[PDB]
């Protein structure tokens, strides 16, 4: 097919084990809202996420790659545990679904043909895969205290050939230890054999270490009390007791738990070490492949690496990262509010650390041996629904927003710092214009440098393009801005008020290739000091602004606010020259104006709302005032969502999309009178939400891209009267949730069409279509 997903930008979730890495073929898969997401962090051309395995219905909590197998388990808040198998070398397809537990699944750890599921009702369910077919059968379920211990983290190990341990942490300061054997059709001899004690608070995460020395290994358990405890598991003939007939005076905290697995594997698990001083909780901890180094990812925006002291046999801080000022979802002051789950994998001589940034963006750290560590590129994406996708004036870059209080400027990576164009264009997050304090809704481009946005408030703010991002884009994407270096400097996040100041006086150059960035910007830079200054806010609306559009003349901006009556369902128009408003209103609607469009010719304004009626207003050339020209009464039965303007070449013709599961194309006519009667109509199976039409004509037919409410995107070719289905996008190349915005890129690079998709599945997609 000629349609390929060029870029995907999804934000990671916030759970404690959202992510896990396939080791034998390093591939990081992490949950993101309703879906999972794949990622290669070591691609030669630096691509981020490329496929979102849909199928769940709620937030994906835990994802675990079944070691030494082509399986990965995922757990959803909708009480579903799914098993996924590699079909492609770099893709997976759901094979098995487990619906049970009547509750959320919290902890989920897997071993070859042996997975463990912790249900928040308080149950631990061990599942063993059937020998004959790739399918898991419920092996054994058991509970602890039945009303007091609910699980929080799980991890199990293969102590012997057919014997298995299970360490459960939960709402208890005692780590429970169960052991069992595998009978090739089920498990038996299973019960809680030990309760390791020494913690004082909840046990957040725990993880066994690889048995590189048979008979003994190490198990770490990190608590909420900022402590880590290392326990020494010693199998028989290596238990190494203390001769008790001569009194050695052992302490009670050094009690050794001995138990029989079946009757004969005497295990003598003993506490080994106390790791001190994490300054906050231990959100995620994980061993190393070979070396005896322990990675602790904490909730104090910090991540560090311990190792045994070569001198005293104790543990010290080998490495520490995250000291660059930030606070996860905030950045003004750090201290409790940073790092979620962590992955730790080594390429040739490169210890990559990968970490959730409490903002939907991954963070990389590549270090050579143990000391020199530098940030490599990661990925990003919103954590909440994405609403508006505003293309730059000529498709140069993409402005995105979200219900999460942020807007982000993306662009593809083309020209290296050296100057020569790269091989394949990779899209990266290049600016974060608004770390706002309102539910961002509607953003639209004014020009190459100016852009106007409105979140959840009665006002809407215009921003200029700052020097930093503009120069850096000209370095990387090679954008030509007439060299007009009168643009204001890079801004900051205001420590007072909310209007984005210039940031000239405070920032705590970079555009130059000799600066610290040879690649798209880094997360610290991006969220702290790569903002955009604000020009002006435009009062006038009463309620929260809902829909916004800009006229091609770059003079008048049309805006509406959410309402429930006629006196608030009016539309305002603002003059860009003085940032003030128009004197009258254009009141016909009674409900909230959903989509509002300015025609290719700046004389016709299209409005549509929940009244299921559309309207078209003329414009006075002389006075820049509008008046009613056309209106409709029952163009649809249910609500209408979005209306779009066809290119002027195809004529004065527009289109509406409505929850009748239908779409109607209206072209102007003059036979009995002047109006745009319904020239065409299509009906789908699911409610249609967004529709986008390419500005450019192709072979006497316009390209209309329609988006459904379950995510399935259709591409259509429309001649006069008849609509030709170009294609529909398969389940692999569509978001899993309602589509909120579709916008055809005005640019056409290397003979391809770019389509910007923004869905309610916390994801913005860029699609490439081949049409020469």
């Amino acid at each position: 097919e000629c349609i390929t997903p060029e870029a995907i930008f999804i934000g990671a979730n916030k759970q404690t084990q959202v992510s896990d890495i396939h080791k034998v073929k390093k591939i990081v898969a992490f949950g993101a809202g309703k879906t999972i997401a794949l990622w290669d962090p070591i691609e030669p051309n630096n691509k981020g996420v490329y496929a979102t395995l849909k199928g769940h219905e709620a937030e994906v909590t835990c994802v675990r790659f079944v070691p030494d197998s082509d399986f990965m388990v995922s757990a959803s808040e909708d009480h579903h545990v799914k098993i996924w198998k590699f079909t492609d070398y770099s893709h997976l397809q759901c094979i098995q679904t487990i619906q049970h537990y009547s509750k959320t699944i919290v902890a989920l750890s897997a071993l070859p043909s042996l997975i463990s599921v912790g249900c928040a009702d308080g149950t631990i369910s061990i599942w063993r895969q059937n020998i004959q077919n790739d399918e898991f059968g419920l092996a054994h379920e058991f509970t602890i205290k039945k009303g007091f211990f609910y699980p929080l983290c799980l991890s199990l190990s293969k102590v012997e050939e057919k014997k298995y341990l299970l360490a459960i942490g939960g709402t208890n300061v005692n780590v429970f230890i169960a052991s069992f054997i595998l009978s090739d059709s089920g498990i038996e001899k299973c019960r809680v054999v030990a309760e390791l004690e020494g913690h004082e608070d909840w046990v957040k995460s725990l993880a066994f270490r690889h048995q590189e020395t048979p008979g003994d290994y190490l198990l770490c358990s990190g608590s909420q009390d900022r402590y880590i405890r290392l326990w020494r598991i010693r199998i028989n003939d290596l238990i190494d007791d203390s001769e008790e007939d001569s009194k050695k005076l052992t302490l009670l905290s050094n009690k050794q738990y001995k138990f029989q697995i079946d009757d004969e594997l005497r295990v003598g698990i003993n506490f080994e070490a106390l790791i001190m001083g994490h300054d906050d909780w231990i959100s995620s901890l994980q061993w190393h492949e070979s070396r005896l180094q322990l990675l602790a990812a904490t909730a104090d925006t910090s991540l560090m690496v311990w190792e045994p002291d070569e001198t005293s046999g104790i543990w010290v801080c080998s490495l520490r990262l995250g000291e660059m000022s930030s606070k996860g979802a905030s950045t003004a002051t750090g201290s409790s509010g940073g790092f979620w789950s962590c992955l730790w994998f080594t390429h040739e001589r490169m210890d990559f650390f990968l970490t959730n940034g409490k903002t939907g963006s991954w963070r990389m750290w590549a270090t050579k041996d143990n000391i020199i560590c530098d940030q490599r590129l990661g990925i990003s994406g919103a954590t909440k629904d994405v609403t508006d996708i505003a293309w730059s004036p000529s498709g140069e870059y993409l402005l995105a927003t979200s219900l999460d209080q942020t807007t982000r400027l993306f662009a593809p990576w083309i020209y290296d710092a050296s100057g020569r164009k790269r091989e394949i264009a990779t899209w990266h997050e290049f600016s974060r214009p608004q770390i706002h304090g309102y539910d961002m809704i509607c953003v639209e481009t004014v020009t190459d440098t100016r852009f106007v946005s409105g979140g959840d408030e009665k006002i809407l703010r215009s921003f200029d393009l700052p020097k930093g991002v503009a120069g850096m884009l000209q370095k990387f994407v090679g954008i030509q801005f007439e060299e007009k270096s009168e643009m204001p400097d890079s801004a900051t996040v205001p420590v007072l008020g909310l209007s984005n100041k210039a940031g000239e006086d405070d920032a705590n150059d970079i555009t130059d290739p000799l600066s610290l960035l040879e690649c798209p910007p880094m997360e610290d830079q991006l969220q702290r000091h790569l903002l955009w200054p604000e020009v002006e806010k435009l009062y006038g609306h009463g309620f929260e602004i809902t829909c916004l559009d800009i006229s091609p003349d770059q003079k008048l901006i049309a805006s509406a606010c959410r309402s429930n009556n006629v006196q608030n369902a009016v539309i305002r128009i603002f003059s860009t020259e003085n940032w003030l408003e128009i004197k009258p209103a254009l009141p016909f609607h009674s409900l909230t104006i959903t989509r509002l469009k300015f025609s290719k010719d700046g004389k016709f304004l299209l409005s549509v709302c929940r009244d299921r009626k559309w309207a078209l207003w003329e414009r006075n050339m002389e006075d820049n005032t509008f008046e009613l020209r056309f209106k409709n009464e029952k163009p649809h039965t249910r609500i209408i969502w979005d209306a779009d303007w066809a290119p002027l070449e195809f004529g004065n013709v527009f289109v509406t999309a409505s929850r009748d599961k239908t779409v109607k194309v209206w072209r102007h006519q003059k036979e009995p009178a002047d109006d745009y009667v319904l020239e065409a109509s299509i009906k789908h199976t699911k409610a249609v939400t967004a529709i986008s039409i390419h500005d450019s004509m192709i072979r006497e037919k316009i390209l209309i891209s329609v988006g459904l409410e379950n995510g399935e995107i259709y591409l259509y070719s429309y001649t006069l009267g008849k609509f030709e289905l170009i294609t529909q996008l398969n389940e692999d190349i569509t978001p899993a949730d309602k589509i909120t915005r579709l916008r055809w890129s005005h640019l056409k690079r290397n003979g391809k069409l770019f389509l910007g998709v923004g869905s309610s599945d916390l994801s913005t997609r860029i699609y490439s279509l081949a049409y020469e």
Binding site: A58, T61, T104, Y150, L152, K204, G277, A329, S330
Partner: protein, 527 residues
């Protein structure tokens, strides 16, 4: 250097103090002097604090040596750390169906402030904490609890307050998210489902001993009360501001007093505890009617709420009161007059009603006209002493403030029991108190679920007495005594087969050892 010697000075101070305290020996010169004798070798402005040295103790020694500096019961022993958070700014519900907003609420979403929630001015410490957290509950809660931890408190019972406008007028998904986020920032669980969040927070360390949700009388219907009891709410705060219907009418209040009284009855019969707001110096009131309404408030057996909040009317720029104060239509009281009025009002507060607060802490440089100082209760108590009468408020008779302000210790504890009728129900008020010195050591409210107003499926099935509130401040087997006497009362005095206590989700385990089983959102026990 400038500051390094300060860090190493704190370090040696910590190590030496730990070494001294291991065998049980105190310091000599209040370490700051010893700190300086070493760190101010050049006297380069190095000024330590008690918090500074506390943030130096190692974990194993910190958790065991920290409370050996503080001894006030409610401060670190009772440990009900009032941790206030705020919701996103929004417009209060009545504005839609009346035409304009309350005529005295400063700030909001469409005032001169673009950032502060309704009825807030964006200058209180809570507002700066909310904005520096961007109104996100997770950051708010984590930051506040961490600041409390840093300042050396050994907090273990966080009590949440949800200030700001009417929290109950938000889309249900948003409120569910807010409450789950609060409980998650407390316990550490990272889920999203309210049921699981509650179940996890119940076992949690740093118990959520309750949560207060200030609201409006209209938005406290049966379904709303069910919602807030799902959340974990334990005390309600209701705006009243006046018993005279004309004042409520002229203030664009939007809810009749009869509605307030009905809401009081149904909420107190839902097991809650209500604290009401009572504004003096409202327009068209005058001192005579001010005293009249405050004297009726405790005399009408219909309101008689357990808490109170006296908020003298402060006019601030931008409100609906500035366009009425500027014209001179309304003139405020006098400083001496208002102090006297507060004195006389406080003289009438019955022993059970607790005065949670007095005049708002809105900054002086912003108030156009109203209360001058910020220490109104100080002058009120001085004038009370001058007049001879004395205060019976719970907060003015509880042990904790006495041990640090009055410096008086309790030695004549005795059992006292009030028995009044409020909101159509029979409410007992048990306490262990000091009759000679009027010092309240422990208290416990109790209510006979009235047939007229109760609605919970847990209560209408069989006769029930609700332990609406149990509080012990300053051996120490009091909760046990009060609970046993309440059991005796509910078995004989009330004739109730099942007695159930409403409880913050954090403390639900404490009643477990008392033999209570969890029924719905209450900790119940049959008899």
């Amino acid at each position: 250097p400038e500051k390094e010697r300060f860090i190493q000075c704190c370090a040696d101070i910590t190590l030496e103090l730990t070494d001294s305290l291991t065998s049980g020996t105190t310091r000599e010169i209040n370490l700051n002097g010893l700190i300086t004798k070493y760190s101010k070798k050049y006297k380069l402005k190095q000024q330590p604090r008690l918090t500074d040295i506390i943030n130096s103790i190692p974990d194993q020694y910190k958790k065991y040596l920290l409370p050996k500096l503080k001894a006030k019961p409610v401060r670190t022993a009772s440990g009900i750390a009032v941790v206030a958070v705020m919701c996103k700014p929004h417009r209060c519900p009545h504005i839609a169906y009346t035409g304009n907003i309350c005529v005295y609420c400063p700030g909001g979403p469409d005032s001169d402030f673009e950032y502060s929630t309704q009825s807030y001015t964006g200058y209180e410490p809570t507002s700066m904490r909310a904005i520096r957290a961007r109104y996100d509950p997770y950051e708010q809660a984590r930051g506040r609890v961490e600041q409390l931890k840093q300042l050396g408190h050994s907090i273990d019972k966080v009590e949440y307050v949800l200030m700001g406008g009417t929290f109950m007028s938000l889309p249900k998904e948003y409120r569910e998210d807010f409450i789950v986020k609060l409980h998650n920032a407390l316990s550490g669980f990272n889920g999203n489902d309210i049921d699981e969040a509650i179940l996890y927070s119940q076992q949690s360390l740093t118990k959520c001993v309750g949560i207060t949700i200030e609201t409006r009388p209209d938005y406290c219907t049966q379904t709303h009360l069910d919602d807030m009891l799902k959340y974990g709410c334990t005390r309600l705060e209701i705006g009243v501001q006046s018993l005279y219907e004309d004042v409520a009418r002229d203030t664009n209040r939007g809810h009749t007093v009869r509605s307030v009284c009905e809401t009081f009855a149904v909420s107190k019969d839902a097991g809650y505890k209500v604290v009401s707001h009572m504004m003096p110096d409202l327009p068209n009131v005058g001192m005579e009617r001010d005293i009249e309404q405050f004297k009726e408030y405790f005399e009408n057996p219909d309101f008689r709420t357990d808490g109170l909040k006296i908020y003298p009317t402060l006019v601030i720029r931008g409100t609906g009161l500035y366009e009425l104060w500027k014209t001179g239509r309304y003139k405020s009281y006098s400083a001496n007059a208002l102090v006297d009025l507060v004195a006389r009002i406080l003289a009438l507060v019955p022993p059970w009603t607790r005065i949670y607060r007095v005049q708002r802490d809105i900054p002086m440089p912003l108030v156009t006209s109203g209360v001058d100082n910020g220490n109104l209760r100080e002058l009120a108590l001085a004038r009370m002493k001058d007049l001879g009468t004395t205060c019976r408020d719970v907060r003015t008779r509880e042990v904790g403030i006495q041990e640090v302000h009055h410096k008086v210790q309790p030695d004549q504890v005795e059992l006292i029991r009030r028995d009044y009728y409020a909101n159509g129900g029979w409410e007992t008020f048990l306490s262990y108190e000091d009759p000679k010195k009027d010092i309240l050591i422990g208290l416990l409210r109790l209510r006979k679920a009235s047939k007229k107003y109760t609605y919970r499926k847990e209560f209408t099935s069989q006769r029930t007495s609700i332990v609406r509130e149990l509080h012990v401040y300053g051996h120490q087997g009091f909760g046990t005594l009060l609970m046993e006497e309440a059991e005796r009362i509910a078995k004989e005095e009330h004739g109730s087969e099942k007695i159930s206590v409403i409880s913050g989700v954090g403390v639900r385990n404490y009643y477990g050892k008392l033999g209570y089983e969890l029924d719905g959102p209450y900790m119940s026990k049959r008899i």
